[PDB]
A paper describes a structure:
Influenza virus RNA polymerase (FluPol), a heterotrimer composed of PB1, PB2, and PA subunits (P3 in influenza C), performs both transcription and replication of the viral RNA genome. For transcription, FluPol interacts with the C-terminal domain (CTD) of RNA polymerase II (Pol II), which enables FluPol to snatch capped RNA primers from nascent host RNAs. Recently obtained high-resolution structures of FluPol reveal that it consists of a central polymerase core domain made up of PB1, the PA C-terminal (PA C-ter) domain and the N-terminal third of PB2 (PB2 N-ter), and several flexible peripheral appendages, including the N-terminal PA endonuclease and the C-terminal two-thirds of PB2 that encompass the cap-binding domain (CBD), mid-link, 627 and nuclear localization signal (NLS) domains (Hengrung et al., 2015, Pflug et al., 2014, Reich et al., 2014). The structure of FluPol has been observed in two major distinct conformations.
To investigate the conformational states that FluPolC can assume, we collected a cryo-EM dataset of vRNA promoter-bound FluPolC, which resulted in a 9.8-Å reconstruction. We attempted fitting both the transcription pre-initiation conformation of FluPolB and the transcriptionally inactive apo form of FluPolC into the cryo-EM density map. Overall, the transcription pre-initiation conformation of FluPolB produced a significantly better fit, with clear density for the PA endonuclease domain. In agreement with previous observations that the PB2 C-terminal domains are extremely flexible (Hengrung et al., 2015, Reich et al., 2014, Thierry et al., 2016), the corresponding regions of PB2 in our reconstruction were not resolved, presumably due to dynamic motion. This suggests that, when bound to the vRNA promoter, the polymerase exists as a heterogeneous mixture of conformations, with PB2 undergoing large shifts, which is consistent with what has been observed for vRNA promoter-bound FluPolB, where large regions of PB2 electron density are missing in the crystal structure (Reich et al., 2014). Part of the PA C-terminal domain also fits outside the density, but this region correlates with an area of poor resolution, likely due to particles acquiring some preferential orientations in vitreous ice. Our cryo-EM data support a model where vRNA promoter-bound FluPolC is dynamic in solution. Thus, whereas FluPolC can indeed acquire a transcription pre-initiation conformation, this is likely only transient. Next, we modeled FluPolC in a transcription pre-initiation conformation, based on the domain arrangement observed in the cryo-EM structure above and the available FluPolA and FluPolB structures (Pflug et al., 2014, Reich et al., 2014). This revealed that, in the transcription pre-initiation conformation, the PB2 627 and NLS domains would lie close to CTD-binding site 1 and could potentially directly interact with the CTD peptide, hence contributing to CTD binding.
Residue numbers in the entry:
A (entry chain A): 97 to 145
B (entry chain B): 1 to 636, 653 to 749
C (entry chain C): 1 to 485, 496 to 740
D (entry chain A): 194 to 533
E (entry chain A): 582 to 722
The structure:
Amino acid sequence: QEHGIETPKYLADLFDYKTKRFIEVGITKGLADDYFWKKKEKLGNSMEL
Amino acid sequence: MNINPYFLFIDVPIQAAISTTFPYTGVPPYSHGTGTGYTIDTVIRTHEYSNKGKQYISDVTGCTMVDPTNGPLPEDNEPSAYAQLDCVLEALDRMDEEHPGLFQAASQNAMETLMVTTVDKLTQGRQTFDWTVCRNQPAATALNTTITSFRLNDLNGADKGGLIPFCQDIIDSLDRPEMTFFSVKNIKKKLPAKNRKGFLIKRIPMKVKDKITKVEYIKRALSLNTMTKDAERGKLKRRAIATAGIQIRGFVLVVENLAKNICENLEQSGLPVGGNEKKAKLSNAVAKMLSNCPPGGISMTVTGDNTKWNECLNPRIFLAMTERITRDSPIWFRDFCSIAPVLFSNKIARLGKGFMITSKTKRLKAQIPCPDLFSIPLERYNEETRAKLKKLKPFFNEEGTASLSPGMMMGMFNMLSTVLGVAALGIKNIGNKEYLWDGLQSSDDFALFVNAKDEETCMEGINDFYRTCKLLGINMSKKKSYCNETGMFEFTSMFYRDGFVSNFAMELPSFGVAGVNESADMAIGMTIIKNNMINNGMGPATAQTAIQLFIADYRYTYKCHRGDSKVEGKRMKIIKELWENTKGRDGLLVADGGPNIYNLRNLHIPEIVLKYNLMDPEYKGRLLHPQNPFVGHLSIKMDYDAVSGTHSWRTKRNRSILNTDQRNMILEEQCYAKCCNLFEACFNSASYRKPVGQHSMLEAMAHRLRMDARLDYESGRMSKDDFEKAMAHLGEI
Amino acid sequence: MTLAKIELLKQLLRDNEAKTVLKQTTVDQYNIIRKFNTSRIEKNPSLRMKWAMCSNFPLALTKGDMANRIPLEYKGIQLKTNAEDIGTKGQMCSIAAVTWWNTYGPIGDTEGFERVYESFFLRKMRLDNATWGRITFGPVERVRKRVLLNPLTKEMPPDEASNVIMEILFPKEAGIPRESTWIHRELIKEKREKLKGTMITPIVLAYMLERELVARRRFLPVAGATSAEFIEMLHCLQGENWRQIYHPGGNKLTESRSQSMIVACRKIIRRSIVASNPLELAVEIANKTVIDTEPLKSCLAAIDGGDVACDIIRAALGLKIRQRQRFGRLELKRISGRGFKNDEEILIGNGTIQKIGIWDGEEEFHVRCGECRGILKKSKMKLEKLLINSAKKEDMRDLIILCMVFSQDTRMFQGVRGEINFLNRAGQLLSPMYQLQRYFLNRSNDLFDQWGYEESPKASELHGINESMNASDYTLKGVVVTRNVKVSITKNLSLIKRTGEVIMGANDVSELESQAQLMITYDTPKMWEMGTTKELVQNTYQWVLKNLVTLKAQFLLGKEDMFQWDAFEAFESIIPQKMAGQYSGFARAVLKQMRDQEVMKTDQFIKLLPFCFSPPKLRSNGEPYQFLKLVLKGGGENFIEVRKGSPLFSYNPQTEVLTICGRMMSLKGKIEDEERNRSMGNAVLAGFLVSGKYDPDLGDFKTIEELEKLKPGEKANILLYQGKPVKVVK
Amino acid sequence: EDVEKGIDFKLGQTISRLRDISVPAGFSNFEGMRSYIDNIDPKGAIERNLARMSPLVSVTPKKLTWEDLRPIGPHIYNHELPEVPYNAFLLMSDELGLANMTEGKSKKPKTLAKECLEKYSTLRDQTDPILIMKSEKANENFLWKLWRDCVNTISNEEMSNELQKTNYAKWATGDGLTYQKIMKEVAIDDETMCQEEPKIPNKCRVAAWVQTEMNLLSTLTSKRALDLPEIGPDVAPVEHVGSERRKYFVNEINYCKASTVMMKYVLFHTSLLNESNASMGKYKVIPITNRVVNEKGESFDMLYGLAVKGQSHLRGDTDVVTVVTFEFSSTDPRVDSGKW
Amino acid sequence: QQMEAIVEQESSIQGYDMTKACFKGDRVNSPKTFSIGTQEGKLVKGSFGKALRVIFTKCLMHYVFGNAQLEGFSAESRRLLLLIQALKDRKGPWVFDLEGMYSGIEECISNNPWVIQSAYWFNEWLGFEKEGSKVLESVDE
RNA sequence: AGUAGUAACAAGAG
RNA sequence: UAUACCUCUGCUUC
C-alpha cells in the first residue's frame, strides 16, 4: 500500500526495497525447473521466484 | 351509585380488555436482606421431591447425593422427580424418527462452532462466580483471574486462543493436587515528599501466591452462588436464583448451542422464537388443530404451566439426552458435551449471606454466616427457620454450603429442557385411543391442544399427557393450569381469542426513560412508541400522548426544560442563555432546552438528523465537536439509532470501592487500560475487529511501529533524526 | 506520530507491571483484558439515572485538552470538580458542563458529517420528499412476516461486510485478501472517497457502514407494503382497523414493481373470475389500480417481466405479452411450444420416490442466465437442443445446469446422490424442483458425469465444450456453443391466437396469495372486493347487517331476488368454486325453510344469506348437500360453522351480540319475540325439523353421511354445539 | 510423513470419576450408560410404565359450573376483623389545595408556598392547635411543633428550606433508630439475641372509603392539572386523526379528579427524590405543589400541604427515607374514623 | 389505549372516525354506553368518558396501592377471570384443582385496600354474571 | 415511630 | 486511646 502496488494474494517470503518487489523462496530436492513453473501457476508473476 | 370497574367485563370480554388486569403502572416487589431462607427452601424441596430415590455419599467431594432417576414411580400428585430413562430415550427416539438428521446435524454445527469458538467468548456472561475470591464478579474479571491463576499451575490453554484447550485445562485442573492462585496484600513504602517530614506512606499492593487443596478446589469449581430475585412481577412471595462459575460456562454454551440448533428446527418449540414470531407459530399451530376433526371433533386447548420445573428435572437425564443426541458425533465431542451435566449432577449450592439475629432490648443486630449457621442453639432462630435448618442438616457441609445433586437452577438448560418438553409433546397418543394431542413448549410454560370425538376422551388424553410427563420428571401444575374448548387461551402472557389480542400493559414500563444517556434515551423513547404502535396495538392518539409523556419524563429526569420556559436549575440557567444566544432555536435539541419536533411520522429519525439543517454552525460545531471530552472510547437487549454528540456521555464509576480492600483492581484495571489504549493506537482496527494471535502483545506493537517508522522514513514523513531515534528506541525494546 | 507511540511505549515499558502485561498477554487475550474493570452491571438504570441526575457531578470527562477548556465553575454554577473518575482518570462534571460546552465551547469541524451519517439523512429525504394519501377505516388482515427494517446500500453477510469495512477503514490490517474486495471494489472506492476528509472516529464510521451494509430482518405484522422504505414507516401505514396511503420519496426498484405487479394482477383476476363478463371487471379495475405511484398500465407496459396474470391483463388493456419465466436465476422467454404440467411420481437417482409436475409437450425458449445467453429446445423429460453463447464460466455452467434441471431430463433425475430434502436457513421446505436446483448448483459433477458426451459440431461458427467450460471435440450431449449471438382475449380471460389456439389459461395462474412489495391501491369505489378472506367476510356481513332491515323484509316478498346482490360477488371470490354451488344450494334451502315455514333465525339468516349468491348445486335426489362447517380459502381458521359459532362468525344470545372476525355488533331491537326457546335444529339441516329431544332409543348422534341417506319422515339424533342434544326429523 | 489431525480432548481421573457417579440407578459406571443408550431399544417403555403406575396419579379433571365459583375471600365480609385503613402516601379525594393565581410560570417552591400562605394567612397564622383525632403512637406536641417549624421556615425571608434538627424533628424523622451492627463472635455468645419472627400483614375487612374514593376520583371537575408538553406539527392524516382524538380522549381525563391527584404524586415525588439525593443529611421541608388551570384559562398554583424530608443517605434502592406529611383537608375524620 | 382500541374497532365497523360517535353520539349512531356500576342492587349505564376515567382511576390505584399482594392477587385472579370468560362464551372449561387456584388467590388478600375492594367488586360482578347465565342455560334446550 | 412484609432500612466505613 | 464538630461513600457484591 505504501509503495502503491497490488497486494499478493498469497503470503510472500521476502521483499526487495530497491526493486519494490516481493520475493518467494523455494527449496526443492530434485530439479528446480520443476518446482519453478509449478509456482508460476499460482503466483503468475506477482512475486519474484 | 357505586362504580365497579369489573363491570366493563360485562360489555368487553376479558381478552379484549386484558390490559386492564395488569398493574404495571405500579411498583414491582423487591427483596430485602438475606435470601438464605429462600435458598434453603429450594434445597429442602429439591430433595423432598427425590428422597425416595437412592442416597449415597460422593467419594470425590464427600457430599450427600440423592438419585431419583429410575426410582420408584409416584403414587400421588406431589411433584415427582423420579424420571424413567427408558421413557426419555423412547421419547427421544420418536423425535429422532420424526426429525431424522437434525440430531447429528445440530451436533455437527455445534461442534464446528465450538472448534472456532475462542476464549474471549466467555466475557459476555455478565455476573460470574469467581472461585478465587468466592464472590460474584464481572465475567471478564472472573475469567482473567482464572487464567492468571491457571498460569501459576502451568496451564496455558488460553494462550492458544481456542476454547477447547481452555476447557481441557479446566477438566485437567481438577486433577491438580494443590491449586495455586493470586491474592493481593498491601505494603507501605516511603515515597519522597515535600511534607515537613520529607516522605509519604502509600500502601502499594502486591500479589501473593495462595494454595487450595484438590478437594476444596473441586468443591468451589462445583459451587453455585445464590441470591433473591428482585422485581419479579405477578407474584406474592419471593424466591431464589443462582449464579454459576467460570468452569461450567464453556461446557454449557455448547450444550445450549446444540439444544438451540435442535429447537430451531422443531415446530412445537417456542424457543428461541421472537415474541412476534411466536404468534406466527401459535396461530398456525391452532389453525392446523382446528381443521383436523370436523365430525363432532372437540378440539380442546390446555393453558399449561409446570410446577417445580427446575427442582424436578435432573442432570442425570440431561446427560442421557446429550449421550443420545450426540450418537453420530465423534467421541471427544460426546465427552465434551457430557461434562456440564456431570458437573450439575454433582453441584454444590452456596447459601448467600445467612441469617440476621437481633435484640430489641439492646437494639443490636448481627449477621450469622452460613459456616456459623449451626454455631448457635436452634431455639434462638425463628419457628420456620428452626424447621428448615433441621431439614437442611443431612445436605449441609462443614464449610457452610449445601450439597444438591438433583434439580436444576433458575435458567440454566432452558433449550435442552424445552427439548425434553417437546419430546413429551412428540408422543401425541397412547394405546391407539381415539384422540391426538399437540402443542407448544417454552421451558416451564406450555400450551397443549387435544383433539378427539368426545371431551371424555380429551380429558383422558390430557390425563395421559400428565401421567406421561411424570415419567420425564415434568410436573404439570394442577392448580395453575386449566383447560377449555379451543378458540381462546393464554401462553407466556400472550392471550389468544380467535386471534392474539394486544397486551399493551406488558410493555408499558419500557416507555419510561431508559437510563443510558440524553442522546440514547430519546432514540429509545421514540423507538419504543414506534414499535408498540406496530406490534402492541397503540393508536395514533395514545402514541402522540406517549410522545408527550416521554418528553415530560425526559425533561424532568435530565432537567432540560424549554429555554423559553422559566423553570430554575443549574443547567436551566445556562439553557436559557443558550436559548437567548441561538438563532435557530428549533434546531436545538430538547437536552439543550430545545423544542420537541417529533411526531408519529418521524419517530424513526434521530433528533440531530432531523434538526441538523435548523442548527447554527457554532451550535452544531460544539454539539458535534469530533474530539469532545464527553464521549469516551467507544467499542462496537435492543440497539438504537443515534448520533455521537456531546449528549452521548457516560456517568462516573461507582466510588464505593475506594474505601474497601478492592482498591487494587483500579490499578490492575488502568494498568491494562493503558496497554490496550496504546495497542489500539498501534492497531486502529482493534476497537472494531477482534485481534487474533498467540504471539506476544508487545511483539505486534514493536513490529508494527518498526514498519510504521521505516515506511514513514522512506516515504518522506519522518526525518533521519526521528527515524534513527525511533530505531534506537525500538532497538532497546 | 510513530515517534510518540514508540516514546510512550518506552515510557510504558518502564513500569514492570505494564512490561509483564505486554509480554505475558496475548493478542487474543487483548479481547479479555480490555473488558476488565471494577464496573458492575446496572440492573436498574432507569432508576440509577434518575438518582444520578440529582447528584452534583454525575458525569465523567475524558482526560485531555478539550476537558481543560471547560472551566471549573461558570457564573456561580459548578461545572466540574478536581476529583478524577476511577474509570477515565479524567475530571468529573455535572450535566451543566454539557450545556456550557454546547453554548460556549470550541466550534469543531463538522465537514463530512452528512456523508458519514448519510444513511440516516436518506430517511429524512425519504420522508420530506414523500407524499401522503387517504386514510381509510375498516378491517385489515395483518400477516406476520420477516422483513427488512431499513434500506441498505448493498446487502452482504456480516463476515463479508466486515472485511469491506476493514478494507475501507483499516486497509493495512485487513489481513488475508478475500474475493469480496474485487466484487465491491467500486463501493470501497466510493466510500473511501466519501469518508476521506472527515475527523470522526473510525469506530463510528464502521458502525454506520455496518448499519448500511448488514441487514436487519425481523418479524412484523404487515399488510400490503413490504419494501424497506415502507417498513420503516410501518407504524403509520396501517393498523388493525385502519389504513393509510403513503408514497415514499426517492427512487424505487424495478424488481419491487415486478413483485407487486403480479400480486395485483392475480388479485384483480381472482375477483373478476366469479362475476360474469370477467374481462369487464378485470379491465374496469386494472384501469384504476395503482402501484405506489405508477398505474398498472404504465408498469405492465414499461416492465418486461410478468408471469401469467400480467400477460392476461396486458392482453385485456391492449399491449404485447412477454411470456417470460424465472427458474431461480435462469430467465426464460417463450419462442414456441406450449407445454402442460402433469403430476407424476419419479424415482430419483439416490433411490427415493418424488411427486413432481412433469411438463408434457415440446417447447422452445430464448434463454438467459446472468451474462450468458442462449436458446433452449426441450421436450417431455429431454433436452433436445441447447444453443448457447460464450461467456463467464460460472454463467455458462449455471446456465447449462439450470437448463438441464429446467428440462426435467431423466439423465438429470437419475444423477442424484445422498439427500435433496434440505430446508432453508429459517427452516422451510423448498419445492421439489428448486431443491434439485439448489443441489445441482452445488454438486454438478454427478450431473455432468451422468449426462453423457458426443461429437462436437464441425461447422465453423459452432463449437462444443466440456465439463470445465472449455472448448473440446467431445461436447455434452445436446449442448452447443455458437459464435453468433396477433392475440385476443376471451370473456373468461383466456388468450386466443389467430389460429384459434389458446395460449394463456385463466385457470393457469397461481392461487398462492402473497404479500406485495409496494403500496397496492385501487382507485375505485369498493376497494375491499380485492381484499383478504376475513376482510371480505367482515365487510360482507357488515353490508348485510347494514341492510338487514330491507333484506329481512323482502325475504317475505321477493322469492329469489335477494340471493343475487352486487356485494356478494366479492364474498363468493373467497369460496372454493368446488363447493360454492353445494353451499349455495344448502343455504338457500335452509333459508327457504325459515321463509316458507314459521321458524325464523335472524342470526342464521345473516350468516347464510351471503353464501347463496353462486348458482346452487343440489344432489341427484334434489336434496342439497348437508354441512357442519363452510370452509373458505386460506387459513385453517377461516370457516363458518352451521350449528356452533366459529373464529369468523359467532352469536351471543344473552346480550344479543354478534361477533364478526372479533368485531362486535348488536342485534338488539332486530329480533323476533319467539326466538327464545327456538332450537337451532330447525335451521341446521335443509328439510329438517325438531320433533322432541334426545331419545336414547334412536341411538347415537347421526353424521351427515347418515342424515343425507335417511328417508323422509324419519327421526334421528343431532348434536348442535357441545352439550346440546336434539331430536330431529326429515 | 503425513498424519491425521484429530481434535485432542480427553478426560482426567477426577472428572471421569465424577462422571462415573453421575449415572442413573442400576449402572455400575458411565460406560455402561453410554453403551446402554447407544445400543438398547426402549420402545414400549412408556406404555409399560404407564400400565404399572398407580391410578392415584391423575389430573382429577372436573367440568366447571357457575355454582362452583364460590365468592373469593370469605373473610373480607367478617365484621370481627378491622376494616382496612387508608395507607397511601398522600391524600387523594380528601385533598384540599390552597389556590394562588399566577402568571402561569415556574417559581421557587418556597416562594410559591410562601405566597400561597400569604394569600391564606388565617390558616398560616394559626398557632393554636385544635386536636380532633390522634394516631395511636403519635406525639401531638412534636407534630404541631414540626408543622409550625415548617410553616415558619417556609414563610421566612431566607433561601434555605432546611429544618433545624430538633428533638421533635428527630422523633418524626426517626433519628438513630437503626440497630448497631456487631461481630458475629459477639452475637453468637449473646444468648438474648434471636431471629425476629417476621411481621405478616393483618387480615382486614372491607371498607367503604375505597368505594367512595373510586366513586369520586373518577368524577369530573372544572380543573385541569396535566402538564403535557408540545409535539411536532401534523402532516399525515393519521396525525390529524390522532390529534383530533386527543381532544376527546385527553381532556376527558384531564378534567377529572384522578388526574390532579396523579400529577400531585408525580410532581411531589420528582422533588422529593431530588432533595433526597441533593441534601442527604439535611432535614428539609418540601411543599406539596400542583399547578392547575380552570375552564376560563387561569393558572392557579395549588398547595395541598407541607412535607418533612427525613435523613436520606440512601444506599440500596430499597433503603427507606422517612417523610412526614401535613396535608390540608375538609373531611371530618370522626365521620369515618376507621379510615384514619 | 384500551378505549382507543374500542374507537378503532368501531371505526372499523362503520368506516369512519367513530370517536365523536362513541363519546357524544351523532347523526347516525347513539353514544357508547357501558355497565359502569351498581345502584340499590341494579346495573347503571355510564358513558364512554366515564368508562375511560374508571380505567384511568383503576390504573392510578394500581400504582397508589401497588405491592406484592396486588401482583399476586391480579396474576392469580386473572385465571379465574379467564375461566369465567370461558363459561360466558360456553366453551365448556375444565379445572383440575380449583381449591389450588382459590388458595393461590386468597392468600394475597390481607391488608391492601384495592385488593380487598377488588375482591368485593369481583364477587359482586361474579354475582351479576350468574343472573346472566340463566339466559343461556336454557337456550335451544 | 414509621416505611414495610416471611427481612430489611430508619446511615455505613477509616 | 487520639486525630475525627474530621475524612471517604449512595447498585460494588465478601
